[model samples]
Target: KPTIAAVGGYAMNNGTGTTLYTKAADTRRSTGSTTHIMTAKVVLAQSNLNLDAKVTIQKAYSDYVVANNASQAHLIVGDKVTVRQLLYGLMLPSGCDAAYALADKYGSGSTRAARVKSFIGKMNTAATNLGLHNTHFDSFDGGANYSTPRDLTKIASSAMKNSTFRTVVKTKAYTAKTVTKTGSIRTMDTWKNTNGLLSSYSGAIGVKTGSGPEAKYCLVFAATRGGKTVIGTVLASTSIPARESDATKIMNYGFAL
Candidate 1:
């Protein structure tokens, strides 16, 4: 009963997995929040990377939010936050500002543009390393990013292998604390996962969400049932409610559609 009256469609990531193939739901532009998968990879690549390391939130990041009309973690300027918290900020809400911050932190250069460019280069490198020939990321938060359903699922599968990446995306809600300029602790607004399937769909685990005017509504999803795990994606689905319905129904039949 999976709905397929597509403005966009879904792709289930089911190649080599912990269990048998459920169904081949060839389902993408790319991930919205799923871009965090690679950003997390870049962070993990640092030999000396410390999740506890603190980064001072920048006005530039907030400005980026205003200009791009991007979703945000609502990070405060001058508040210093840890790398660990930023990952939550990045994934839980698909924060573009969080993406900007991570790109700034991890990318190398004297200028912000250079740093972001460098970070994107790393994303492409990670994609190449994963054998994802069809995936390309032009933005940290999924603008102008492209990937086939198969390629995206492959990226998700590879990223899920990293325990840290697994932990972040699977989370439904998170609150990140920041150290203010005066050194007082400030609690941020709670960031809830945009993916409704986490609570509605049984055995739903970690993944990401994405949407654009052009991309419509998209999702990368995974679930575990009776010790069997299934993963997949939905690209350009008509609406949020419908896609969630499609996801549940599709997985219910093990991607039989």
Candidate 2:
């Protein structure tokens, strides 16, 4: 028997091929901050979308200042950033800071949280606009994140079609300027992707993974089988053993897919 590592335990493997379903597609949950993968996709599409809209940072989550690694981060308001860079920041380093930054900037209602509310709404809207069936955006920078096996399949599928989204997803790492909405820029923080499969699996072709206490350990592993690309999205799963075990299986299947 071969020992395999599970990204977490208990993943839901979806169908394969265009069998009305696609192989290498999965939907499960785990414990990690994985929503950034989808968030990254949202921002990538919106950036330079010619919407001419701008996002403000510098959020004061006094209500959520101490929840889930939340505290006043380094982001300042009036700092202008493109949706392009936000994608890198969101996906790389599991930057909750970036998540909040985007939510505060784009969320609905009023104020920062309201903006995130609005932004996440847009994320959900993006899904519909993009025609993702299983994927959905539930939380914002400071709230919960979600996706379905089938939803992520389509999300990753369409996102990769864009040259810009594909570039940032596989770039390995990125860095962006710390700025306030007012045009004040500060030192830069570098970010490296958390998707270890790139190094762990053959022909990984780049994808995202996630984890959290509520969402449990999660992962979205992808690879090219022959010439087709397969994506796996695991939501709330069991433990580390489960995550890796399930993920390994998914990846193997995805590779063969």
Candidate 3:
């Protein structure tokens, strides 16, 4: 096993779900924007899902981000964006606003708060269905959520089985075009993936990056080389750079295995 001293927990597996390495992998810890992974997964898993379905941006979404001082995709109020575009925003910029939009769109309920709560319930349901006893969620945008490294890796690997999910995560940057309230086409600001491994590590494919006061720096990473893929998670690393480095080393070791 490679030495991964800086992280609170770590785990890796072959793309097919065989464990390769772990360190405190079963220990539950706070998950930051990494919670968005399950948020996207629940959205994508919706029956008869329509990627082109448009959801109107809401002012409440913007207000929520401001209230939390959270990351955002800068979605404009009244601009209409597709489910597909929102997925990019949710993953790339770790957009809480995009997350809010999605939860409102797909979750069942009449009110926004009730719908968001319903969506979080679905996230937890997905975890339970996957037999991940160590994972739980309380918010769509990652507040007070927890997951073990092993459980997170499994969730990511399962999500990657969806080709659309796979494509969204691997993308380094994206620019979304939405319909304005006046029916004009509006080009939104570009969203870049927060996962630095895509640029810094060879063969790096995707996953997600996250951080918060309690979660510290967290990363879920995957890479493909010679037709073999390794997927993993590193939680509570000291900093952005350290999380990436820890993931890099773990992937290197996984490939060797």
Candidate 4:
């Protein structure tokens, strides 16, 4: 195994759920925005999901982003965006607002709060069904969320099996065209993927990126070379560069294996 620098936990696996290497991979830790992988997973798993179904943007979603000082997709209030676009926003930019909107749209309840809570419940249920005992979510956008590197890798590996997820995560930039309140077409600001590996590393596919005071610079990364795929997670690295470097080293080792 290669040495990794100052990382709290890490794990690598073949893209199909086979563990390759790990360091503190099972110890539970805050996962930051990477929790959205499960968010996207749950959304995609909806029975007979309609990707083109439109969800209305709300003030509450924007306000929540401001309150938490979090990232967003800059979805205009009253603009109708599709479920597919929301998934792109959620994964690419790690948009908390997009997460909230999807939760509000898909979750069954009369009130916004109830709907958000139900969506989070669905997140937890998805984790449970995956048998990820060390994973849990307390927020739709990853606040107070926790998971092990091994568990998170498993989650991403499963998520990559979906064609939409694979496309969304690997996307570097996207522009969403939405319907305004008065039915006018609106082009929103571009949302860029936070996962740097997609650009820096050869064969890098994707997963997600995350950061917070406690979670600190985390990433779930995937790549393919010569018909083989390597997917993994690095949690609590020292910085963005460190997380990417750690992932690079781990993946190089994974490929070598």
lDDT of 2: 0.56
TM-score of each: 0.89, 0.70, 0.97, 0.96
> Which residue ranges in model 2 land beyond 4 Å of their true spot?
1-32, 47-56, 59-66, 70-82, 107-110, 129-136, 141-146, 177-187, 237-245
Task: List model 1 lDDT by residue over 199-257, tens digit each.
Answer: 99878986778777776677778888776667866666787887677667667767442
lDDT of 3 by residue, 1-257 (tens): 77775455555555466778778889889998999999999999999589999999999999999999999999999999999999999999999999999999988999998999999999999999999898999998783589989899888988998999999999999999999999999988789999999999999988999888999899999999889898989999998888999999988888888
Lowest lDDT 10-mer window, candidate 4? 6-15
lDDT, candidates in the order shown: 0.76, 0.56, 0.90, 0.88
Judge candidate 1 at residue 48 and give its lDDT: 69
Clash count for candidate 2 is 53
Per-residue accuracy of model 2 over 1-257 as CA lDDT, tens digit each? 12234322222222333422233234433224555655666665664453234455443433343455641233444566555565666666665666776666555576765677677787778878877654556765323355565566566666666777667667676766655545577556667777766666666655666666566666666665556665655555566456545556666754443
The model with the greater TM-score, 2 or 3, is 3
lDDT rank order: 3, 4, 1, 2
Q: Order of candidates by TM-score, top first?
A: 3, 4, 1, 2
Candidate 4, residues 30-110: lDDT per residue as tens digits?
988998899999899999589999999999999999999998888888889999999999999899999999999888899
- Leading candidate by lDDT: 3
Top candidate by TM-score: 3
